[PDB]
Amino acid sequence: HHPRYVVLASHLGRMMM
Amino acid sequence: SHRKYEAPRHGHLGFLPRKRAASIRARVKAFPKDDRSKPVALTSFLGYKAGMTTIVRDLDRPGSKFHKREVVEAVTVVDTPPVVVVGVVGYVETPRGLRSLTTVWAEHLSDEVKRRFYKNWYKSKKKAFTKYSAKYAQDGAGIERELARIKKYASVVRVLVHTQIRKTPLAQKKAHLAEIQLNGGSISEKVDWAREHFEKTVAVDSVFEQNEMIDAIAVTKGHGFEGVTHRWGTKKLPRKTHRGLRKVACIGAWHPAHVMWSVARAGQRGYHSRTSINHKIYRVGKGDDEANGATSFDRTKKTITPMGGFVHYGEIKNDFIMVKGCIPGNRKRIVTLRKSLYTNTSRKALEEVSLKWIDTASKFGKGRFQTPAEKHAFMGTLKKDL
Amino acid sequence: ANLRTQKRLAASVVGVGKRKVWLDPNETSEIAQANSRNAIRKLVKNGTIVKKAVTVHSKSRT
Amino acid sequence: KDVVTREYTINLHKRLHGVSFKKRAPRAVKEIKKFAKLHMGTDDVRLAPELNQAIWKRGVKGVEYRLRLRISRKRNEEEDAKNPLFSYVEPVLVASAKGLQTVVVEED
Amino acid sequence: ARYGATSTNPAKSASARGSYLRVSFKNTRETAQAINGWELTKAQKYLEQVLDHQRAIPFRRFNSSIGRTAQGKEFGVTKARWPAKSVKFVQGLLQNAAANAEAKGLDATKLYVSHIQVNQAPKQRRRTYRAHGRINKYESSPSHIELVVTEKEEAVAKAAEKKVVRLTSRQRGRIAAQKRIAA
RNA sequence: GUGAACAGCCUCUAGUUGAUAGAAUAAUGUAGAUAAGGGAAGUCGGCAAAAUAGAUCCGUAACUUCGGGAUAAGGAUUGGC
RNA sequence: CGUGGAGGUCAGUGACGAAGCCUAGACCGUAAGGUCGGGUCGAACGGCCUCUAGUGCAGAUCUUGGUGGUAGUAGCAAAUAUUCAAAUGAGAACUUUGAAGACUGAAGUGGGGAAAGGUUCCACGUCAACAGCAGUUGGACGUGGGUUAGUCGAUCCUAAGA
RNA sequence: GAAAUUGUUGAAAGGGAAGGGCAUUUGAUCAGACA
């Protein structure tokens, strides 16, 4: 069977602020 | 916002689209203006490009620093055997353009000109103008009634001429066919001249003179799909560019929200139809003349062909026209020469040229000798000599 | 004919590597019947399996 | 349609000019099969093992500029062979394989 | 033993079929459509030439992003290919169909492919491994194939309806008038 | 074997010849290169690449916790018989 | 109006075909829906008067299962490299044999072991599935054979510790 | 043995979407008063 997990997390940078 | 530093655009918008030409012949869009006063004569010619060589001559240009001094210039030779006239076509002026009205062919057409009407000659019955030739019959009423209509109605008369390919060294056996406009004389004299010249040849010396200025039309050398940097000369991106650096960075703004025709994009480079202008003739040689390459100041019996033959062409054995510089096209290709469309009175146009020496060292390398007799004198006997 | 096991046994019996053992290409049907180390030891005598010579490494230039 | 044998010379320089080094000897094999077809009209061409050694004598990228060959057109004895005839190429042992022109070899 | 829609006389046909065959369904459909309606002799020379690479199968529906070729000209198409593996299967079933026809006594010359169809079969499934430890599928696509060959015939239609005309009273008065004026 | 060297390169004993293939050689790529004249004018920044390099002989500054700096810097030689 | 079930009745329907499904075939109702013809099928279902409720779906990044367009598309491009002949076979670029050219290059692509796996070891038969191409080959599938100790280990002693 | 999705056969339409509402022309298909 196929176990699954959180795909990527992080590596999305940051925005506006 | 506005671009920070200005600069001219890359490329010319008058030469769009940059696509392959429809035919290997570049077509003569415009012929010289007519005046009925002079004699009948052709306005263009057909030839085959051969190669290039070098010329040394004096300069007759009062005022310039090099007046009465030697100068070395480049020239390109065009193999031009005589052309054969095989028909006449008449054009009427209509409110929505010119329009052909009749084509009258000759009786006997050579094999190499009727190869132009077959794709698979080797398995054909050679049925071409077979029924048309039975029109001359015993009287020729049909043919002479057709010519009557051209004299009556046509305002522009042209002539169909096919080049004698078999004489040139090309492996091709099919002969080109193109239309040349007749200038000079009444509409009556024009169609008579064509009829007398059916199956007859027209040599190059009867069209061009030595110091004329002419225009060349031919299809340029092809290269295939090409990137932006060598199709439009765009700047290259810095070294540290992800996803390539031979690309145009910005291909437009957010709005209009469509890529504009003015942007540089990759695609076909080469194989276009071009019309260069203002080329001065330097020699009108004769095929059956030895010492085609000699001059008043040289005086050595040698022909125009370098040692070992023009690379990728062969040897010249017919008439030829050498012009100052480059003409569009690559070697071996059909090239059509035209008379200029205006009277050029500049000093360059009127200058008369007398050559001093034509080059014949081999173009297949760093040639050192001009004649095989010159090689033997310098080197002396070798082992392979008797 | 699949004579892979015959090379293996031949190498140990003749006492060399598999790169140094020769099997006669015209005696396939004979070698195929040799499933014992006795049989391989009898073909070596016959000449159906021969020991290839060692490649030369001459010390002359040295 | 006839049993005929002949001797040729093949200029392998002009056929391997520009070819990648790891593919010079293999491609020469293919060109001797193309050459035998052009002259004998047999789709089935069998190269002798001794010819294979002549080609591969100097590694992948050491093919000889010219090779003298013997092409023999023969009959197919095999049942249900697609083609009645087939060719067979062998090497010819000579000091220098240049300066020679094609010539027929008599059966006996 | 039940086939698809057909309209030919069963007494003059012989059929063959094969099921659960591991060959691409998209390729095999193009192969079958190219033989549809041909005479049996012509189709079998045609397929042999596709293997020999002299002719090509015109690709019509399953043809997105494939290459162009000069051998689609005759079929009116610019994209075509040479499905080797799918030609062998269709080639095998035509041979079976010819064998059945001679068992029934049909005349081997008039046969033609009056029916051929391909539809999907249960998948065969596997696993592929992707970056970041993700599993996906790597399935196949088998196909069912069937066909029928029939004797050609010559039309013998006849005995059609007369289509009697029903005249009104006003019309019959006119027609009677025309008769009296002239014969 | 070469050499200071279980560096790099070639070979002997032994072991593999395993990684989907055939055909052409477009643009854009990844990896490896070379460029006339100028020589950092590029860039936030000599980022990247280049130039130096082994061994023998000569010569080696400021400063110094007197041990170092130091392979400073700068030159010359090198094959075969 | 429609659904599962319950009490009464129609002495209701049915293996001479109940329920279910399909039908640009028909009729009734504004509608929710009811009714009939045909084809498929094979065993139990409905009208009317009442009772009762786990009682009606287009959505919830809804739950489980099945299937598409993308699409015969992206792609199967690291580790220098393959080639000629015969044999076997329905079939050979990939198996077996022979000849050739190459590589690991003795801190190896060699020769053994420790932890860990558990029969993968060897033979015979064999190719539906697995070896992201192929296969006659295989660490695959079916069936069997195989691991011999007074001396090599465990066992015995003690270390941190229990 | 339903639906999604799919092959063949038959009918029809197709200038940068398809689908729907009112009305009729054309093609196909259905019922009948009937005595």
Curated annotation (Swiss-Prot), chain A:
Subcellular location: Cytoplasm; Mitochondrion
Binding site for (2R)-3-phosphoglycerate: 10-11, 13-14
Highest rank taxon of the organism: Eukaryota
Family: Belongs to the phosphoglycerate kinase family.
Function: Catalyzes one of the two ATP producing reactions in the glycolytic pathway via the reversible conversion of 1,3-diphosphoglycerate to 3-phosphoglycerate. Both L- and D- forms of purine and pyrimidine nucleotides can be used as substrates, but the activity is much lower on pyrimidines. Negatively regulates the biosynthesis of acetyl-CoA from pyruvate in the mitochondrion.
Subunit comment: Monomer.
Further comment found in the protein's record: Present with 314000 molecules/cell in log phase SD medium.
Name recorded for this polypeptide: Phosphoglycerate kinase
Taxonomic path: Eukaryota, Fungi, Dikarya, Ascomycota, Saccharomycotina
UniProtKB/Swiss-Prot annotation, chain C:
Miscellaneous note of the record: Present with 97700 molecules/cell in log phase SD medium. There are 2 genes for eL19 in yeast.
Cross-link for Glycyl lysine isopeptide (Lys-Gly) (interchain with G-Cter in ubiquitin), residue positions: 20, 52, 59
Lineage start: Eukaryota, Fungi, Dikarya, Ascomycota, Saccharomycotina
Subunit (UniProt): Component of the large ribosomal subunit (LSU). Mature yeast ribosomes consist of a small (40S) and a large (60S) subunit. The 40S small subunit contains 1 molecule of ribosomal RNA (18S rRNA) and 33 different proteins (encoded by 57 genes). The large 60S subunit contains 3 rRNA molecules (25S, 5.8S and 5S rRNA) and 46 different proteins (encoded by 81 genes). eL19 lies in close proximity to the binding site for eukaryotic initiation factor eIF4G.
Keyword tags: Cytoplasm, Isopeptide bond, Phosphoprotein, Ribonucleoprotein, Ribosomal protein, Ubl conjugation
GO CC, one annotated term: cytosol
Cell compartment(s), UniProt: Cytoplasm
Coiled coil: none
Gene Ontology biological process terms in this record: cytoplasmic translation
Descriptive protein name: Large ribosomal subunit protein eL19A
A Gene Ontology molecular function term of the record: RNA binding
Record-stated family: Belongs to the eukaryotic ribosomal protein eL19 family.
Residues the record lists as Phosphoserine modifications: 29, 36
UniProtKB/Swiss-Prot annotation, chain D:
SUPFAM superfamilies, alphabetized: Ribosomal protein L31e
Subunit structure: Component of the large ribosomal subunit (LSU). Mature yeast ribosomes consist of a small (40S) and a large (60S) subunit. The 40S small subunit contains 1 molecule of ribosomal RNA (18S rRNA) and 33 different proteins (encoded by 57 genes). The large 60S subunit contains 3 rRNA molecules (25S, 5.8S and 5S rRNA) and 46 different proteins (encoded by 81 genes).
Domain of life: Eukaryota
Protein name from the UniProt record: Large ribosomal subunit protein eL31A
Keyword Glycosyltransferase applies: no
PROSITE patterns per UniProt: RIBOSOMAL_L31E
Further remark: There are 2 genes for eL31 in yeast.
Lineage of source species: Eukaryota, Fungi, Dikarya, Ascomycota, Saccharomycotina
Pfam families linked to this entry: Ribosomal_L31e
This protein's encoding gene: RPL31A
UniProt keyword terms in alphabetical order: Cytoplasm, Ribonucleoprotein, Ribosomal protein
Subcellular location(s) per record: Cytoplasm
GO biological process, any: cytoplasmic translation
Main location: cytoplasm
MF GO annotations: structural constituent of ribosome
Function per UniProt: Component of the ribosome, a large ribonucleoprotein complex responsible for the synthesis of proteins in the cell. The small ribosomal subunit (SSU) binds messenger RNAs (mRNAs) and translates the encoded message by selecting cognate aminoacyl-transfer RNA (tRNA) molecules. The large subunit (LSU) contains the ribosomal catalytic site termed the peptidyl transferase center (PTC), which catalyzes the formation of peptide bonds, thereby polymerizing the amino acids delivered by tRNAs into a polypeptide chain.
InterPro entries referenced in this protein's UniProt entry, alphabetically: Ribosomal_eL31, Ribosomal_eL31_CS, Ribosomal_eL31_dom_sf
Keyword Metal-binding: no
From Swiss-Prot, chain E:
Compartments it resides in: Cytoplasm
Covalent crosslink: Glycyl lysine isopeptide (Lys-Gly) (interchain with G-Cter in ubiquitin): 45
Additional notes on this entry: There are 2 genes for uL22 in yeast.
Ribonucleoprotein is among the record's keywords: yes
Assembly mode: Component of the large ribosomal subunit (LSU). Mature yeast ribosomes consist of a small (40S) and a large (60S) subunit. The 40S small subunit contains 1 molecule of ribosomal RNA (18S rRNA) and 33 different proteins (encoded by 57 genes). The large 60S subunit contains 3 rRNA molecules (25S, 5.8S and 5S rRNA) and 46 different proteins (encoded by 81 genes). uL22 is associated with the polypeptide exit tunnel.
Presence of the UniProt keyword Ribonucleoprotein in the record: yes
Gene Ontology cellular component list: cytoplasm; cytosol; cytosolic large ribosomal subunit; preribosome, large subunit precursor
Protein name as annotated: Large ribosomal subunit protein uL22A
Key words, A-Z: Cytoplasm, Isopeptide bond, Phosphoprotein, Ribonucleoprotein, Ribosomal protein, Ubl conjugation
Family listed: Belongs to the universal ribosomal protein uL22 family.
Species name: Saccharomyces cerevisiae (strain ATCC 204508 / S288c) (Baker's yeast)
Example of a GO MF term: structural constituent of ribosome
Modified residues (Phosphothreonine): 69
S-S bonds: none
Name of the gene this protein is made from: RPL17A
GO terms for biological process, alphabetical: cleavage in ITS2 between 5.8S rRNA and LSU-rRNA of tricistronic rRNA transcript (SSU-rRNA, 5.8S rRNA, LSU-rRNA); cytoplasmic translation
